[PDB]
Write a protein that binds this ligand. Structure first.
Ligand SMILES: *[C@@H]1O[C@H](CO)[C@@H](O[C@@H]2O[C@H](CO)[C@@H](O)[C@H](O)[C@H]2NC(C)=O)[C@H](O)[C@H]1NC(C)=O
Ligand SMILES: *[C@@H]1O[C@H](CO)[C@@H](O[C@@H]2O[C@H](CO)[C@@H](O)[C@H](O)[C@H]2NC(C)=O)[C@H](O)[C@H]1NC(C)=O
Ligand SMILES: *[C@@H]1O[C@H](CO)[C@@H](O[C@@H]2O[C@H](CO)[C@@H](O)[C@H](O)[C@H]2NC(C)=O)[C@H](O)[C@H]1NC(C)=O
Ligand SMILES: C[C@@H](NCCCc1cccc(C(F)(F)F)c1)c1cccc2ccccc12
Ligand SMILES: C[C@@H](NCCCc1cccc(C(F)(F)F)c1)c1cccc2ccccc12
Ligand SMILES: N[C@@H](Cc1c[nH]c2ccccc12)C(=O)O
Ligand SMILES: N[C@@H](Cc1c[nH]c2ccccc12)C(=O)O
Ligand SMILES: *[C@@H]1O[C@H](CO)[C@@H](O)[C@H](O)[C@H]1NC(C)=O
Ligand SMILES: *[C@@H]1O[C@H](CO)[C@@H](O)[C@H](O)[C@H]1NC(C)=O
Ligand SMILES: *[C@@H]1O[C@H](CO)[C@@H](O)[C@H](O)[C@H]1NC(C)=O
Ligand SMILES: *[C@@H]1O[C@H](CO)[C@@H](O)[C@H](O)[C@H]1NC(C)=O
Ligand SMILES: *[C@@H]1O[C@H](CO)[C@@H](O)[C@H](O)[C@H]1NC(C)=O
Ligand SMILES: [Ca+2]
Ligand SMILES: [Ca+2]
Ligand SMILES: [Ca+2]
Ligand SMILES: [Ca+2]
Lengths: 801, 799
């Protein structure tokens, strides 16, 4: 037949069931020295007993209601799996026992309410699909069961895990973490979920540090290896796809070693597990964020639950062990002795200490789905069926494949006003709820508080809602933890690569002296336009600096004062000779060449005033010829009076000025000078300077000036001794000598300096030469004429010679 | 009862077997409108038929042998799986029929020769483990079957895929690639293998572009998506963990789109598959590199194979369909009519057209393992058994759990002289061979050429051997392909991050100025230490130059020659004055003062030699006073012999020197100058110069000298017209003018140059001033004393 411990009742139509009443089997590596025996189950499961009671309650309600299946009863045959494949397959062999008589007594089974674990469900479905017996599961959520090529008669009332993996990725992206590790159970439930999560997290630019597998039957060395892998890591957020039985040993080891500060993200299987939500583990598993399914209502279920008895439950064979485990007594069929009149409310167990019904509602829904398919078969009308020619099935000889067909074409409304339909893959979609683990002040137990939800019917990117103010991190903290591999670079600083490490870990390197950085996390430094240079902090770049000899400057003001003083002195000398024209010393110097020379000296100082200021196109063209013309005129006026025909004395000056003017015009027409902004000298600053355009013409001008100064020198030199005109040759020689020594002296500075000081030396040299010429030629004569010798030599000495 | 078509023979002990005689089942979309019927298998598998024949040959050889299991016979019951779970479970229910009757005319099965696919073997083992019936598989290599908490009676004669997944990464690292993609079958064989490969590749710093899943029953849309993923990638190497049936549709679609240039890494399941190794597909799948198992020898297998007959094989129910498929005719119990007189050497099929036996040898060994376990049960001695009190099992009433117990403790030698034994998880270990797909020049078919091996008994990093000169990369090329995400940086450039991409993809950025890099693939430019600056190419860094006025430089030699010439000239004027000491011209002035003046001229000239050369602290501190003191001594000597200066003469000169000396001493105690190596002015040049410490004191040492010179000027200027000592006061004013003119004219250049030329300017100024001071006074006296030996001495202003 099958297992001796069961819950069964007779009826017209029989339903099968598989529930975990125990958490596992005994650890016994049999050595095969004798014939093997049956294995034993260990730890009782009050939640599984409640789920079984939910199935029985639904069946009894259906049998009581006259509106769903009149004059037809339902039976059941329910077994225990102990979360093990081997035990489940023994019970499945009894389900198909009658059907195998024809293919290769127990009444035939129509449908089976599925298992809990995905591996157990796959093992059961492989065998149930041979005979086309429908199977409806309440807890299996693996994506591997959606393949209808291998599983032909599998349905479920629970959604699959792809949406939940995407939800975890969305949560991690919401809190702005990029450095996590993963842990998964080594079975059909954890591995596909963790693979989907990895695929989703890779496209959101999240780096995963470690990934490990665990099991209920792992050994101490494996546990310690996983613990060391966890301990050596800097990541704080850990994502776990597992259940309580598969997770308990690792949690126990971590608690013993006292590892704190971790952030756990829990899947639906262990997010509400009483094996892990223990008060003494809170310093490790406090403040967990996990997922929960949607709750439903079953009105009289609790009153039904409070009625179980070891003696009155004849059809329930698990009630005896339930009573013994609940009250820690022994039942003497005719540790203290059970008396049988105890109170269930006295002992606190997960049997009735619950707030929401989630998987129990799924069991209820699966039973009602099977009942509604049978009712749809019952109420068929001839000619309008789902079979060939519109024929209807026979309710007195209904078969499992016909029940499966009507299950595939099913649509009904539940007790809450919602529609229930199965898709082409036999899946049912639903929302998710997000919970946080708190600590109770009144009792000291774990309290699950809602903090958000995940809406599956919304557009991508608007599925997650979280109320952050209700979250206590690690159970007590109000601050969002930091889970990034490295700190973000700041303004002025740039990212660097570390060899052998993922893209999420980098080094902050400073930007160079020509580039800057505005925001955080720059992968390169930006070069800014050519008229700007980078700031010291390198946050931005400031404008460059323009440098030229300018007015409103202490140096330029002094130069201007010197120039105007020279102009005024020349004007005063001219006025002196104007006043004293008739008198004799003024006449023994050609009267009008003196005026021309003073005019040329005024032209000289004004020429110096050209160089001060910001260079422009129209000044670089005139500044240099202006000094040349005037100084050649000065030299000519001096040379015509030299010791060696009135209109002839006005011919030489015009001729020399004529050659000078002619050279400048040729040069300017063919290659005029122009302004030239200079940036190559320094990166930081810019110079505004004139560009000559032709050095040949400048050399020719300087050569002509030097040649004229030379001929004067040689001729003034040959006749210095003469005492005429107060030793005029002696002073002319001095004036020429001042010229040559000054210009030769300034050559080096022209050769070396490059900035705003090259313009200053030119003004200094011009003023020096002009003053040296004017003073030497004029001041001795102007002295006697006024001041003391009012008449001492004002006539006779001049008159005599 | 059970499946209709089978191979069956009765005996004392019955074995079970499962083989894929068909590649799959018909794609019937069942809508439930009738009582569902059995599905039908479609494509024939000659390789699977040969595998089935190997088991029968082994059993017949065992039955013929008289030294193994004497006076006992072996039977068998063999079914077909068609590579599906559902068909395999129908046969497995017949294997456990009698035991379940005992649990709750059927012969008992003690052992089953396992299936081919890992997914099928898992489902078969889940049911066979309930009754403790041992199962020995020949082809299932998933690592999930090593878990003995779930699979209590599973054994295999093939190694698992951990070493293969490691060897894939070993080969990839050997050929220096870091940009690959992965493809796996969606079952129990491909997913764990691709997971292990991903772990190892991430361990070896290898970047994976994409990862896709395929299946035999994938629709058009999934294949289109996979092809689109493949065709958008720049990766050229693809790792595949799948079989031929699950890989055929994708290969067909890629062939139709005719995508060339890819490098395929094949797992053992499809590395020798005839569904993929077709001459039409060669332009896409040419040059594939894959794995193979080690071949064995069965010394009578081919003659047994060549003897099959549809009418002489009574115990083989597959031979009729084998004959029909082979000869394309019909057997009587519009295809033509078969006879029994065809020759199987005419039609070329994988049945007898093979080179090596790899899985057939595994089947042979799987049968012989059970045979030797039974023999070990047979020859047990009382008190030396494996059971509770040392007892022995009974061969007449043997049981499957006892056979499993003896299987767990098996150790025997096979026909190749090798030892066979199963470890704690019921696994074997074995070598791998590496093959390369070539094209036959004569037949046009595909030839599998061996190019290496993988030794699993060696140490990590010494297990792979590749003979690279035997590899054709696309079937026609001898150059290793390039499969890196980005090109490698050059000598002067470093890496740079590309956001949104893995570490294997980067950009090259040039090193800045003052930094360099030298390795091939740098991630950070290096700042080489101070006193060094980068090259133009930023590849190596060179030493920068030290700039100072050097003795060996010809400018310094010329200045030294000038100084030496001045020193000598002073020596002749002193020697001449020494010769004519008491003569009238030398007696005219005070010779006691002329010697001091000539001695200070040498002191001045030598001060210039203190400027030339590499600066040091003491020379720098000694430069200025050495000239100042000597020149003030000269000036005082001249002054005290001008008109009406009034020994007191010696007093005045020394007193004036003592003032400049004290200013000098007050300077050195409070603010001495020192040497400096200047880095701020330029980048590639280092300047050695002097800071002058306190500039104010130097101001005093210049103003005092200028005032002393100026006073001498005025008083000489007053008396410029007395014809005494050959117009002495005419020449003193000239010397003062020369000194002032030289220093005034040298102002500009001193304040324009802060390089190595400033010292040259100072040297030139000192030399010019000293030469002027010499020639102003002494040249005229010498003029008429070198010649005119005594002409003017008698009455020079009346001597
Ligand atoms: C941790 O790393 C993440 C990922 O780089 C950072 O999130 C980025 O934050 C900036 C500014 O807030 C955004 O412009 C980016 O779009 C974010 N990236 C992503 C992928 O969302 C986060 O700021 C980092 N946190 C800390 C504390 O460094
Ligand atoms: C697996 O392959 C290795 C490498 O070929 C084998 O070791 C070699 O065996 C040959 C034959 O005896 C020796 O000549 C070599 O010296 C061995 N070492 C090497 C590095 O080649 C090994 O025997 C093979 N294992 C099995 C079981 O065949
Ligand atoms: C492709 O990339 C790999 C790894 O980035 C390069 O392998 C390196 O090659 C250099 C020179 O041959 C060796 O010094 C390194 O040790 C190698 N690194 C590793 C991890 O093996 C390879 O050279 C690149 N190939 C091309 C063509 O650029
Ligand atoms: C005002 C002055 N200009 C000097 C330019 C120096 C220069 C700057 C750049 C290049 C060159 C050179 F390479 F051409 F020499 C020289 C000047 C102007 C006109 C006549 C002059 C005659 C005598 C003295 C000065 C004269
Ligand atoms: C060797 C010389 N050192 C002068 C440096 C400053 C300077 C450089 C160029 C020009 C001028 C000056 F003409 F303005 F002084 C000063 C020195 C040392 C000690 C005493 C001196 C007395 C007179 C002259 C030079 C003296
Ligand atoms: N979905 C889980 C089973 C499961 C869901 N909720 C649970 C609650 C408790 C225990 C198990 C479960 C699986 O496939 O394996
Ligand atoms: N070992 C493979 C099957 C296999 C190995 N070699 C083969 C050769 C041909 C066909 C299939 C195979 C698996 O577990 O699935
Ligand atoms: C953890 O760290 C220790 C000490 O640093 C190191 O020796 C060890 O290899 C690491 N182990 C794991 C499993 O990461
Ligand atoms: C199920 O029935 C409701 C009730 O009218 C209907 O609105 C809904 O479309 C039905 N669903 C399907 C899939 O037919
Ligand atoms: C899921 O949640 C959204 C918003 O919270 C709600 O509108 C929707 O009706 C929910 N879905 C179901 C099936 O209750
Ligand atoms: C391949 O590239 C094209 C062009 O960018 C794009 O439209 C397509 O979506 C890509 N394929 C996939 C699978 O992303
Ligand atoms: C198997 O037997 C041989 C003797 O033939 C022995 O050398 C070898 O060690 C044995 N193997 C094991 C694993 O005991
Ligand atoms: Ca009813
Ligand atoms: Ca690494
Ligand atoms: Ca025999
Ligand atoms: Ca990317």
């Amino acid at each position: 037949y099958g297992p001796d411990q069961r819950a069964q009742k007779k009826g017209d139509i029989i339903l099968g069931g598989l529930f975990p009443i125990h958490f596992g089997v005994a650890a016994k590596d049999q050595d095969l020295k004798s014939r093997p025996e049956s294995v034993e189950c260990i730890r009782y499961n009050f939640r599984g007993f409640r789920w079984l009671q939910a199935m029985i309650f639904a069946i009894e309600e259906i049998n009581s209601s006259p509106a769903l299946l009149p004059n037809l009863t339902l039976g059941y045959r329910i077994f225990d799996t102990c979360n093990t494949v081997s035990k489940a397959l023994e019970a499945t062999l009894s389900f198909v026992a009658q059907n195998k008589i024809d293919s290769l007594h127990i009444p035939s089974t129509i449908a089976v309410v599925g298992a809990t674990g995905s591996g157990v469900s796959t093992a059961v479905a492989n065998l149930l699909g041979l005979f086309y017996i429908p199977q409806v599961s309440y807890a299996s959520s693996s994506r591997l069961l959606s393949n209808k090529n291998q599983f032909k008669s599998f349905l479920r009332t629970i959604p699959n895990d792809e949406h939940q993996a995407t939800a975890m990725a969305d949560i991690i992206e919401y809190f702005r973490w990029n450095w996590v590790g993963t842990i998964a159970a080594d079975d059909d439930y954890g591995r596909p979920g963790i693979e989907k999560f990895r695929e989703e997290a890779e496209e959101r630019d999240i780096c995963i540090d470690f990934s490990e597998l665990i099991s209920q039957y792992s050994d101490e060395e494996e546990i310690q290896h996983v613990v060391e892998v966890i301990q050596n890591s800097t990541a704080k957020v850990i994502v776990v796809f597992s259940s309580g039985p598969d997770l308990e040993p690792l949690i126990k080891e971590i608690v013993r070693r006292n590892i704190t500060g971790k952030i756990w993200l829990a899947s639906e299987a262990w997010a509400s597990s009483s094996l892990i939500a223990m008060p003494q583990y809170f310093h490790v598993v406090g403040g967990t964020i996990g997922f929960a399914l949607k709750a439903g209502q079953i009105p009289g279920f609790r009153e039904f639950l409070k009625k179980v008895h070891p003696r009155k439950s004849v059809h329930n064979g698990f009630a005896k062990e339930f009573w013994e485990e609940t009250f820690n007594c022994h039942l003497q069929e005719g540790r203290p002795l059970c008396t049988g009149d105890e109170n269930i409310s006295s002992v606190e167990t997960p049997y009735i200490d619950y707030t929401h019904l989630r998987i129990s509602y799924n069991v209820y829904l699966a039973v009602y789905s099977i009942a509604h398919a049978l009712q749809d078969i019952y109420t068929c009308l001839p000619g309008r069926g789902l079979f060939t020619n519109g024929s209807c099935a026979d309710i007195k000889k209904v078969e499992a494949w016909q029940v499966l067909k009507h299950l595939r074409h099913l649509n009904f409304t539940n007790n809450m006003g919602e529609q229930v339909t199965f898709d082409e893959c036999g899946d049912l979609v639903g929302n998710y709820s997000i919970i946080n683990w708190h600590l109770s002040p009144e009792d000291g137990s774990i309290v699950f508080k809602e903090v958000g939800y995940y809406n599956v019917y919304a557009k991508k990117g608007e599925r997650l809602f979280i109320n952050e103010e209700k979250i206590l991190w690690s159970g007590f903290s109000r601050e969002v933890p930091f889970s990034n591999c490295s700190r973000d670079c700041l303004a002025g600083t740039r990212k660097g690569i570390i060899e052998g490490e993922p893209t999420c870990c980098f080094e902050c390197v400073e930007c160079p002296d020509g580039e800057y950085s505005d925001e955080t996390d720059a992968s390169a430094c930006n070069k800014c336009p050519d008229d700007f240079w980078s700031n010291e902090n390198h946050t931005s770049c400031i404008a460059k600096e323009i440098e030229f000899l300018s007015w409103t400057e202490p140096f330029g003001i002094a130069l201007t004062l010197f120039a105007v003083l020279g102009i005024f002195l020349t004007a005063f000398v001219l006025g002196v000779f104007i006043k004293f024209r008739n008198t004799p010393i003024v006449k023994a110097t050609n009267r009008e060449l003196s005026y021309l020379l003073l005019f040329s000296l005024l032209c000289c100082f004004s020429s110096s005033l050209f160089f001060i200021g910001e260079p422009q196109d129209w000044t670089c063209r005139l500044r240099q010829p202006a000094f040349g013309i005037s100084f050649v005129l000065c030299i000519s006026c001096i040379l015509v009076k030299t010791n060696r025909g009135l209109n002839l004395q006005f011919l030489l000056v015009f001729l020399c000025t004529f050659m000078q003017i002619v050279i400048c015009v040729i040069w300017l027409y063919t290659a005029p000078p122009s302004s030239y902004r200079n940036q190559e000298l320094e990166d930081e600053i810019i110079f505004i300077t004139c560009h000559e355009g032709s050095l040949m013409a400048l050399g020719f001008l300087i050569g002509y000036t030097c040649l004229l100064a030379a001929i004067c020198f040689f001729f003034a030199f040959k006749s210095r001794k003469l005492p005429e005109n107060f030793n005029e040759a002696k002073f002319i020689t001095f004036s020429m000598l001042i010229f040559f020594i000054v210009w030769i002296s300034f050559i080096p500075a022209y050769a070396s300096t490059y900035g705003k000081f090259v313009s200053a030396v030119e003004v200094i040299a011009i003023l020096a030469a002009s003053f040296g010429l004017l003073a030497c030629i004029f001041f001795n004569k102007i002295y006697i004429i006024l001041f003391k010798p009012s008449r001492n030599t004002i006539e006779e000495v001049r008159c005599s010679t």
